[PDB]
Amino acid sequence: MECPFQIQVCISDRFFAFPHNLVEPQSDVGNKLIENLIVYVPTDDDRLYIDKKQFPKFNSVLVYRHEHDVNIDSRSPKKTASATIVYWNPLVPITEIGAGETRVFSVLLTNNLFYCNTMIVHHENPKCPIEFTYPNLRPIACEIPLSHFKELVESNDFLLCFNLETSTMVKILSLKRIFCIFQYRKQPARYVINLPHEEIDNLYNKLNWERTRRLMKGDVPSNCATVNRSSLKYIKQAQSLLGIPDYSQTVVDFVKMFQKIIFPYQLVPNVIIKLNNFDQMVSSAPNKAEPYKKIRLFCKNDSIAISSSGIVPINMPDFSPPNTFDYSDYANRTNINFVTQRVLTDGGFSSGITVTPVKYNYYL
Amino acid sequence: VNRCIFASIVSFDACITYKSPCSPDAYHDDGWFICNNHLIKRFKMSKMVLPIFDEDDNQFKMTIARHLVGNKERGIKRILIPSATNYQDVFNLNSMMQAEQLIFHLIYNNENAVNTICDNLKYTEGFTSNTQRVIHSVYATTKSILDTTNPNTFCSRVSRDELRFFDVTNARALRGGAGDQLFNNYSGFLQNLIRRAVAPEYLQIDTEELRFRNCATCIIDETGLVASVPDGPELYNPIRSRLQIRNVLKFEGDTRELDRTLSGYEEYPTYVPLFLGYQIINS
Ligand SMILES: [Zn+2]
C-alpha cells in the first residue's frame, strides 16, 4: 500500500502526549479557511486528556474513536475538504481526509505507512532502560500512563499486566508508549512482565522490523535490545559457571570486559560468536542455518580485518578459491588415519577420538 | 501433585507429628491452599459453592464459605480473622508449634521474629538438616502465589473497573465504608482469600446490575473480620458437630409423624451465607 497523495506523517515520540500546539487551521485554495476540525483517536480514553481550549484558533472541534469500516475501503480514500481532519497515533488505515493536505502525528510506523511523506524530527536519547525480574514492586495499571505520572519519574521498578481481551496492536501500542518515556527518564527502570512472552518476543521481532523501517530515515540510534530466550538462558548459564557476585549484572558488563582484549588478541570471542549465532535471524540464523553471516570486523587504521575465521585483507570475499591449497599430501586420509592410530594406541582409548587438519584463508 | 499449605506444613520432630492431615481436596486446585479440615479447625468456617446460572444451567459457579460461629459468643470469640495488629492476640502462638508460629509471622510480615528464630535455629542440629530448605520452599510457594501479581492480578487489573466493593450497600450501615480501605492494607494473599470467600450482594454486568440477597450478612471489622451482623441480635447459627444448664423451653410438640407426612417438602438448610457489596464484571 501507500499513503494517498496529499497526506503527510510526523513521527515523534514526544507525540505520545497530544501536541495541541502544532496544528494550524487548514484552508482550501481560495483562502477558504476551515475552522471545522475533527480528530480520530484509538479510544475515548485519549479524548479524556485533550483540551478544546487549546484551540481558540478554531470555533468547531470534535473528536471520535476511529472505526475501520468496510464500504469506503480504497487505496484512494474519500475526501471531504469541508473540515480539517487529524488522526492521532492511528493503528489502522484511514478512509477519509480533511481540508488541504492532511497530516497525522504518530509514534509508530505501521506497515500501512511505508511509502509515505514523512518527517521524524528524531533526537538521540542515550539512557537505555532495562528489564529486571527477580522471580519492592511498583504496581502499574499497565495501560493508562498519567495514572502513574510522577510515579514513573520517582520509582524505577515496575510491573506490567494485561487482561486477556487486549488486541495485539493495543498491546504493542501501550508498550511502545512506555519505552520513550523511560529513555527520557534519568535512570534505568526495571520492567517486570506477567506474561509467557513468547508471542511477545514475536512482536519484539516486529519491533525490529519497525525500527529498521524507522532507520530507513532514522537516527541510527544505539538502541539497546536483545533476544529474550536463546540469549538469556545461555548467558545465565555462563554466569553460573562463572563466579556470580552479581546475578543482576548487566550483560554489557561482560560484553565490554571481553572487548578489552579484542585488539591485543586480534580475534573474536566465542561469546560474541554465540551472539549472532543463537538469534533466530540476526545470527547464524537457525531459521535458515546461515552462518554465512560471518563477521568481518575492522578497527581504526588497520591494514587488515578480523573475520569470524582469522585475519583477512580488507574488502574481499573471505577466501580466494585460488590458494596455497591444503594440498592433499598433507591431510591425506592415509596419514590422518596413521597418526590417529598412533594417538589411540598411546592414549589407550577405545572411542570418542576424531581428528582434522587445520585449514587457511587469504592469510596463512 | 498436592498443594494445601497445611500439607506443606512439617513438624521439626517425629513427635508433634503434623498428623490429622489435610482433606483429600489438597490434591485439588482451589486457590484456598487451606484444606477444608484446617479451615474448620482454625477459623470456624467451611467452604461452599454458589451455583450460578450461566444465563442457563450452563456452568457458572462461585466459591463460598459458611461460618461456624455460634449465636451467643461475643467479641474475640466472634472474630473470624485477625490483623497483624492482633494476630498474636488471637492465635496465642506460643501454644502452637514453632513452624506454625513462623508461618503466621510470615503472613503478618513479622520479619523481626522470623529472622530471630531463624538465626537461633541455624546452629541447631535439626536446622543443619534441611528444615531451612523446607521452610524456604514454603516461602517460595507463597512467593509464587503472590508472583501472580499481589495487587495487579488480585485487583489492580487492566480490567481495573471489574472491582469488588465490600462496603455495605446500606447508606445507614455506616460502620462499613473505610473497611474497604482497610482491605487494601491487608496482605494481598488475604485479600485474595476474601475475594474467594465473600459473595457480593450485587453485581454490575453489561447485561444488568443484579441483586442476590436483600440485606448484608456481616460487616468489615477493624482488626480482622468477625461475625459482625450489621444490626440487631446475632442470627441463630446452629451447631452441627459439663455441669451446666441447657434449658430449652420447647413447645410440647405432639404432632407426631411430621416427617413421614411432609418430608417431600423442601427441608430448608440454614447455614449462614456471605453476601457483601457490589462486584463489577464486563459483559
Ligand atoms: Zn491442609
Swiss-Prot record, chain A:
It comes from the Viruses. One of its GO terms (cellular component) is host cell. It is found in: Host cytoplasm; Host nucleus. Keywords: Host cytoplasm, Host nucleus. InterPro entries: AcMNPV_Orf109. Pfam families: AcMNPV_Ac109. Its main location: host cell. GO terms for biological process: nuclear capsid assembly; transport of viral material towards nucleus. The keyword Nucleotide-binding does not apply. Coiled coil: none annotated. Plays a role in the transport of the budded virion (BV) to the host nucleus and for occlusion of viral progeny. This is Protein AC109. The lineage of its organism: Viruses, Viruses incertae sedis, Naldaviricetes, Lefavirales, Baculoviridae.
UniProtKB/Swiss-Prot annotation, chain B:
It comes from the Viruses. The keyword Translocase does not apply. It is found in: Virion. Signal peptide: none annotated. Its main location: virion. GO terms for molecular function: structural molecule activity. The keyword DNA-binding does not apply. Coiled coil: none annotated. GO terms for cellular component: host cell nuclear matrix; viral capsid; virion component. Keywords: Capsid protein, Late protein, Virion. Expressed late in infection. Belongs to the baculoviridae major capsid protein family. Most abundant structural protein of the nucleocapsid produced during the infection cycle. The monomers are arranged in stacked rings around the nucleoprotein core. This is Major capsid protein. It comes from Autographa californica nuclear polyhedrosis virus (AcMNPV). The lineage of its organism: Viruses, Viruses incertae sedis, Naldaviricetes, Lefavirales, Baculoviridae. The gene is P39. The chain holds residues 15 to 306 of 347 of the full protein.
